Symmetry: C3
Subunit: 544 residues, 3 copies
Amino acid sequence: YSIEADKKFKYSVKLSDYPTLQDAASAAVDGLLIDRDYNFYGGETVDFGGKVLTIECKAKFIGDGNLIFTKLGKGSRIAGVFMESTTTPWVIKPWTDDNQWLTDAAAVVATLKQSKTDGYQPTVSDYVKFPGIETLLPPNAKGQNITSTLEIRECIGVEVHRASGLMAGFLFRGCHFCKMVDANNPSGGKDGIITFENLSGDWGKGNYVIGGRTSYGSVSSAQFLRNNGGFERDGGVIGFTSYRAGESGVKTWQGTVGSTTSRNYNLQFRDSVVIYPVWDGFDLGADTDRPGDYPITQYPLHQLPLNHLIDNLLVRGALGVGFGMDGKGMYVSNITVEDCAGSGAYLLTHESVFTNIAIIDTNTKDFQANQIYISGACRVNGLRLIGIRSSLTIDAPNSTVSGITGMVDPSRINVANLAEEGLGNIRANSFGYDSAAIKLRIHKLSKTLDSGALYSHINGGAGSGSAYTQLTAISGSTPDAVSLKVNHKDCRGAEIPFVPDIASDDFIKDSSCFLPYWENNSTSLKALVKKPNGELVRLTLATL
Amino acid sequence: YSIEADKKFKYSVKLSDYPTLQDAASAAVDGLLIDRDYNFYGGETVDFGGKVLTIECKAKFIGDGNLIFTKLGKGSRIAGVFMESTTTPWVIKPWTDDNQWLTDAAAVVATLKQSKTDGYQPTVSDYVKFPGIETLLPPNAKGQNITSTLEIRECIGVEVHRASGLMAGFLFRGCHFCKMVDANNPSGGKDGIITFENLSGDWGKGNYVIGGRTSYGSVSSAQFLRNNGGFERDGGVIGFTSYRAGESGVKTWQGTVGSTTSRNYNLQFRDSVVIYPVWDGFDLGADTDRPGDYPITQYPLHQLPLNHLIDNLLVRGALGVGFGMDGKGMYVSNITVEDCAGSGAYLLTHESVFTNIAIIDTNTKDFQANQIYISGACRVNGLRLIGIRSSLTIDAPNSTVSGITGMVDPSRINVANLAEEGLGNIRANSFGYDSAAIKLRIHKLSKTLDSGALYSHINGGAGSGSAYTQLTAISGSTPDAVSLKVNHKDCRGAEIPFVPDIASDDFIKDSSCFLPYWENNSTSLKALVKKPNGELVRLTLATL
Amino acid sequence: YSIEADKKFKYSVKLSDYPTLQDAASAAVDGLLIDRDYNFYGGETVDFGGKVLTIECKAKFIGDGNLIFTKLGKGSRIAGVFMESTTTPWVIKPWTDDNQWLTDAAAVVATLKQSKTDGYQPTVSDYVKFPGIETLLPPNAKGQNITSTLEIRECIGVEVHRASGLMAGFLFRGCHFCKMVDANNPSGGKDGIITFENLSGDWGKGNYVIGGRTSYGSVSSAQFLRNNGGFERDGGVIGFTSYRAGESGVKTWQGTVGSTTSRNYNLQFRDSVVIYPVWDGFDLGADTDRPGDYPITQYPLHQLPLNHLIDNLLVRGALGVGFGMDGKGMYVSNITVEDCAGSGAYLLTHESVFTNIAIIDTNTKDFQANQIYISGACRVNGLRLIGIRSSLTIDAPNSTVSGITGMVDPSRINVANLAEEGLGNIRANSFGYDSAAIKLRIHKLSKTLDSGALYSHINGGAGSGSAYTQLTAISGSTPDAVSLKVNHKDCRGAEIPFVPDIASDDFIKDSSCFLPYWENNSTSLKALVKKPNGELVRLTLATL
């Protein structure tokens, strides 16, 4: 029987049969079943001998600190891991029972409680976010560092599926071609919830976050350090959801970490959602010398050829900035940002294109100077502004924009050039008003007053079948001060404005034209005429 | 050997070894293999003893009625389940060989056949959908109730993967943190195909439909009763496809069911597709007192703070309404609805924002009064109307709209306010016409006639390098009746309209202006002048 | 013990125990573990006896040619397969270290190297793509045919998960209800990477590519031949990414293959991304008689009722065309195409609707005559053109378009009709200029010059509170040649242009109007008057 059995059954070793995780690992050949809770000590390391194993977790790993898995064979997969700290830390909860953000340090301090979820351990960035809190927090709530972390170290082709936990963290250190798939809403701890760190060895590649969901955590939910997806864009975040990040939903690190660059290139950031982060929805910047990276003499600050593939992202309820990034020659598309407390988008980009961007009701707490800020010479094609709420809305000094929609206040727009070059035949439709209008505003003259208009006003009331058209010009900072009318009171004639006094030679502009003016002392209308030959002559036009 | 074997092999029990499902369940420790068809009786209940098991289905469960699974341990997963009724009911197929919907009761009755798919059992709602059918249907096709249902009862953290079946249904009763993942196109029965019901106990939370595909069924494909995803929005429908729902693709129930509320809050409805439902694509309403829910004195009908996260949905071919919902303070984005028989969108919302909505060729069978209806004071930013087809198009009386695109008939638009406040320098480009135009229409005066215009017309023909500009005003319900022209017939002068008779004092409007008028009895042009001091005087302007 | 063991353990056979794959297959009952590399010979066929098995691959299948799997039971799944050729062919790499495309035959020939990835084997289509290359390529780099192919033959309900490989190919021949799920970036060979071929038997149905990622390959990444998803749209490509296809990202075949049609109907093409294909992003055409398909007498060329469900696709960096297709009565939505060398979209469609299309910086190498081409009578609602780059932009002769946004050159637009029928009250906002403008252009008169305008110009400088409005008309091909001004130099009067000479009777248009003209020999302004009765009379208007 032994021979028959050895050839017909699936091999799998189970934790309940061994005293330590390493004993189970050494015995493993194909599958490995975690069938009983295991208390690990921080730094406990397991060597898997290069075996390609399938780890099925049906119990939890308990402990503060890291449980390090090493030498897992390419193709290995861990499913259902549950990480839980042994410590129940002090957590703050900066939001109310109506889901309103609390921004007052005292009100935030009052939310203190010992829990492994539904809040997060204060971190030094909170001292900045809620000014004064550093002084108000009791010593036992400061400097906490609890996280139950599964650290996958220097492995390749290892995937972690349906992970979860309380005060949980997942760290891939020096890994390549690894994936965090369908994270089953782990509640984060002090550290990042999903981190791909490649500060040593080669630049990380093939590392992805696919289809997850995370909640809380003191810092960013998903973060990358020194990763480069290459031209193939092999790496990034796709179909992921982040709830209530203590810092940001997804973040690519900036600047120098240790003695090398922590920046990232050629990653995908698509079809993902970030809701209610204490800081940003997406923090895709690289710059904040650059050892280990491009020199400033080659690429100035904020002008790195990051080349990320960014598309179809949704952000809602950030206390900070909805979407932020930097870079040169970037193409960004289909971004939707709604109901944020800080800027909806903060863009330190140059020579980049933004297509179909919707920034709806953001900067609601006036944390910044505008709803959307663009640094360099960029192009925006399709920009939706204003939802249900009423600083500048958009300040993009060197950018050319087209296709803005929404109830934006014109005085709150600052761009280099705004234009609709390719519209077809047009119709202005007016509702709930006695007139329709097409207004012109030269922002160089005034950002608050229209300089001229073409109106249509009703004569009589509804259903009269009559209206008058008037062409206006501003004078003395009084809009519509001067104007020519056609059909006022259904008279069917043109009412024409004349100079109220003797017209000066320079008033008339073109040849073959005449400018009527008033001669009060003779009660006559005169006409300054500039003949077709350019010569001026004054004629009598109308008299008693 | 026994000891060695007990420690190195994967545990799994298989149905073929036991007489009943319960005997297999009691014997199970890790895996459970369904390797032979099992005929269950309705109400047959299996107790899994709290074990965390992995059920792999490679055969089917056959029977009419429910197969109830209980006490499954957190972490349990069932994959590949196939449900099939024992009965082959009578089904109707309200569509033709060209995929055209049949709406005539007689034509629908004629499609009757006994089958477990490619149709659905008539339900009382069909009596409403195809009027007269109640009288035409034979008694053996009425009141049928066939469904082979897998009922997961009061379990937590249980996932059902790649389910399928004929006349199949999946019901999670009183469950939490459960998921229906990658449904492998089950063909539905009389009941909902995927139902998360939480009428008892706590409000459902953590329940999701992720990546599915379903077909047919007599009622809704995916439906939720008394679920609340909380602020974290833990629950809902993501990446799902519903084909030919007998009622709607996805539905959140409304009103009182039993003696409690069946409503839902804080759920996600994103990246999903609904095609050809007999009723609606998405029915996300809550209201239709409210025991067990908010009182009407707190939130009036249709004004519940539902707070769903709705984004990126596509609907095509609904016989009913494409997208429908109610609520207050909702944010909805990126909805695309095409080729529907009833309204494309029916919105009973108040104080809500709709961003980037496309309603293309809907209400094609004039089932409703408009393509899109909005009840309350809402904001629409970006609205695309009209595809290839020619009631009102949009009736949103109290809403402010901006950014409409498409070949819409202006007379068919009714909104509170329509405006493009932030356009740049504009160019109207005319194709296939001898003129370009910018028309103004005051809907208060007339919804059918333009009240004025600014035209440019060719003088001569193509390539003449000449055109004339004319400014018009409507009079006597005849549009363009009065007008001033510049360069008519390349004359290079302004043609000006004068009052055809003695002008009345009230015809002139502003000071420092003059209004030419005709004096027929002297063959002279006179000028009613309103001096810069406000006084009127009549002067002679032109004579023989 | 034997009895106890036979009833409590999971059955699985492993390759290392058998000499050939067939011996392992015959022994299999539930699971099958590929635990050692297996060298197969081309054409090696394995018969699985109709068993429903779970094949877990933890090693690779090595060989040039096909490894044919047959008679796999419905429900079978293969996971982690790795295909690798035994041959290391000669591959070209048509792109540089900066990711710039190389288009010069000599430069491309110079990239030759022996590798199993990071390039692809030249194919006859390369002779067309890089003209002259056929002559420059050495004989050992021509006509290569290396591919390690897993061929699933005439099976139903079989899914392949997380496949990978080098010079790898996956072929479903005569299959139905099969799926290629989460392809783990296989590097392609000479043949298609994922192919659903149904040239024999029934039309393919239920075949999908779900969530993949592929790289390289000599031809198309994902392709379908003679598949029909039916009205249910059961089949297609969802959530897939294709990098550097030697031909196209996803392709539906056209014309006759063998003696039958290779065309496809009713498939889904959604939420997918294609980057850097040597040819097209998406090639969704059917036409290029039609044996086995609809006759030309029924549906003319390019007018097949294809009916695909197309939505949310992104294309970037194609050397060929971003998005291409043909058909009649199609509905296409939310397509984003950026930075392509050839056309962004080539559409040979008739009676079809395109909603929310963004074509940004395409045809950058002038490979075609335009950025977007539409053949038939179609409708476009929402079209974004121009990113950061400066042929026609859009040539759609018989199409009606609305909602264009972007810095498009008007002279480069050709459509049947362009219109904005439903805009609200309008405001033109001008930045960085001394004037604001609303220009009118009759393309019938001239595609390069505006025929008239309504301007607002500053009088003085910034903050003067004064501006003048002028209405212009083109004359002698000189735009703005004739014009009426209101408030020039803050004079507060209307400057009016008169005919520079005796006005001819035909110059005046309407009754009750007058047209001033010059009478040089008397230094007087006269007025050609057309009385309200239609009679003409010349009056003296202004004299010395």
